[PDB]
Subunit: 225 residues, 2 copies
């Protein structure tokens, strides 16, 4: 499965057109992806037939959200669901840089039968493996987006392996960050992970302010095949 | 008047606590500010008794929007209005790099009761004094956020002055980006503009991922006034 970040309506459409199979709908690539506005979610869902997973992330300053921010995210999840999203992308850490387990429960309390991707917050956790361990606790989590820790994703091929083992098919894993032409198959097959997440690698000049090049998107899709 | 950027709820709260009397509500300071999520709009407006001006800006690739993006922005205006913002912050250009008047009109066609700030799209126009005469043809446009075109703001101070003259009390100008404590007095005095817009100037550490410094805001109040 090739999942591609979309920051604008034209992204969304070219994603589907070139053969991407899932969209991560964001505002602001520069800040790592934040919750997009009402009308963007609304229209993005209406534009294509491929799944839309919307980012639920109110700012990029940390993953330790106030209780007022947790409620804000719950209310964005509810409206997203109403708007037809295929899932939401989120992740909250406690002060230990580990999974905030009660805050996650509260977030998921409003979820009802869409996917849930715990995102690259999990990479800040001291042990993603133990992070993956604690994640498998929550039934509503269907996916996890990850690069297997910090530094670049190549070195982290073994962690990705272990949590794919750890997940034991429970949670669907998605490699994200530093994903390219060259490493994608190298990344997918060495770890056993079957879903990839890209952004710039398929933008013109690999720029998030550029448009989607339908060339670059299909090149990875076929590599995935 | 000090207008202060908020990117999170605590910014919202702190600007009010610091005596700021308006908020520009955005996500992603990095990309100049984009339309925030449904719940951030609703919770910000609820949280404080000072008016909110919310960004209506789908991305930062351009200020030339597709017709569908116009319609997106229309729907976000209707949404934000129902959530009780005090004003919307929007700007649209055409091929000539002049005010996209049919597109602008379309956007304004759902504005009902609230302010409209035409923003720093105007800085990308070659003689922004021209644009003011045009905007005056649109009675709903209440404010203008500008930095005197490109280049240094106090070095743009003559062009800011040019712009202030045609306002005829029709359009409230707000001095923009580049504002500091060292240069804010000069900028209002010379121009006669009575409103200002500040961002990283009032964050502890001069960063947009940092919290707001109440003293730097209070101070900014205490200098302008
Ligand atoms: Ca759809
Ligand atoms: Ca209020
Ligand atoms: Ca239209």
């Amino acid at each position: 499965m090739l999942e591609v970040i979309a920051t604008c309506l034209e992204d969304v459409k070219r994603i589907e057109r070139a053969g991407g199979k899932r969209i991560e709908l964001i505002s602001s690539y520069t800040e790592g992806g934040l919750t997009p506005s009402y009308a963007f979610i609304k229209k993005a869902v209406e534009a294509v037939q491929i799944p839309i997973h919307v980012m639920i992330r109110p700012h990029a300053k940390s993953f330790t959200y106030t209780e007022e921010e947790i409620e804000m995210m719950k209310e964005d999840i509810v409206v997203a669901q109403k708007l037809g999203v295929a899932g939401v992308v989120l992740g909250v850490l406690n002060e230990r840089n580990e999974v905030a387990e009660e805050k996650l429960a509260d977030l998921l309390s409003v979820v009802d039968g869409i996917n849930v991707t715990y995102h690259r917050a999990i990479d800040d956790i001291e042990n993603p493996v133990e992070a993956m361990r604690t994640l498998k606790k929550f039934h509503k989590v269907t996916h996890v987006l990850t690069s297997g820790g910090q530094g670049n994703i190549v070195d982290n091929i073994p962690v990705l392996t272990d949590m794919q083992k750890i997940s034991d098919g429970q949670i669907q894993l998605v490699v994200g960050a530093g994903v390219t032409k060259e490493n994608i198959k190298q990344l997918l097959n060495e770890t056993g992970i079957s879903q990839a997440h890209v952004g710039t690698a398929v933008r013109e000049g690999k720029s998030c302010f550029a448009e989607i090049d339908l060339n670059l998107v299909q090149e990875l899709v076929q590599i995935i095949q």
